[PDB]
């Protein structure tokens, strides 16, 4: 899963 490139990065 979670790669962190989306609109909710923070």
């Amino acid at each position: 899963k979670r790669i962190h490139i989306g609109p909710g990065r923070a």
Partner: antibody
Amino acid sequence: EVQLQESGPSLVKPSQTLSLTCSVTGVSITSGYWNWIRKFPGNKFEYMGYISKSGSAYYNPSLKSRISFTRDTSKNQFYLKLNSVTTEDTATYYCAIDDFDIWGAGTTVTVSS
Amino acid sequence: DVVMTQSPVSLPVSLGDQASISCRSSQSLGHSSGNTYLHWFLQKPGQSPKLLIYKVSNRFSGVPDRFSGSGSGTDFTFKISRVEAEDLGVYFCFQTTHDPYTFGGGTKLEIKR
């Protein structure tokens, strides 16, 4: 295990408003941020904006006056609304997960009289 | 509005050969590769976009090692060592460093059999 499904009218008259729905399955819409993307004929994508974990909405400047997002936890769906459409709004609309690693099949919309 | 200039538009290649796609941004998308949000997607005929490479060089899960990714500041290259028949489709670069998120024009990859 996540699934995305976009639905709406495949035909709209110029000047009317477009209303799309993105049915999310496999995880509640309140778990993260969701994406709205359109693809005009000729392979040309344009990021439309996003709905936050809290229902907030960011709109691509080229649309924020006609564009509008909303959500509904109970139906586990979030929506897109586009006002005064022109034949230039003709495209396949998509909703994808936060990190863009899962999109819906997309729904094609034709703006024509 | 970060402008993503993708070339070539059409890439004819023979099976087993090396394929290269280039993408250039009008703005710096970061300075580290772990801060540079430039990604590569592939769109097969009649399907949704599939994320193949994120953060310039990070290969997503389930993506073969034939797919490579590298870049710097504004220059990014996507490579496919041994082109196979299932690689057929259109490749897109896309950035999420700045709002609004913008895409490259796309590159249509075709096989020379």
